[PDB]
Every structure is written in C-alpha cells, then in structure tokens.
Amino acid sequence: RQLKAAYSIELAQDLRAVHGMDADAELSGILATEIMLEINREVVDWINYSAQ
C-alpha cells in the first residue's frame, strides 16, 4: 500500500503564520492515518468475507 502528498513552500509558511499548523505533520498525519484505517477496515471486511 502507498500514498503521497505534496505542498507548496508558500502554503507551509502562510499556514503557520495565520493558524499555527505546520502543514507538514498534518499531511504526514493524514496519510499515516488513512492507510491504517483501510488496513483495519480490510481485515474486518475479510472476516465477514470468509465467515461461515
């Protein structure tokens, strides 16, 4: 499994100035959390797939 994101330097500089969010952890956190959710969802769906 794989995902990726890309953000402009201007966006990172601007967001931290106006909202305090680094726009790097947010993208890093979102991608890391999204894949784990699917994997957790996939395993549950497999059990309902193979259940007698």
């Binding site: 499994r1 794989q2 995902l3 999204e34 699917e38 969802r41 996939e42 769906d45």
Partner: peptide, 11 residues
Amino acid sequence: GPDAMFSGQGA
C-alpha cells in the same frame, strides 16, 4: 466509511 481501496488496488 473509509474508501478501503485508495492506497490499495485503487491506484
């Protein structure tokens, strides 16, 4: 629910 194909076969 999460689209459990985006990081998988969806790409």
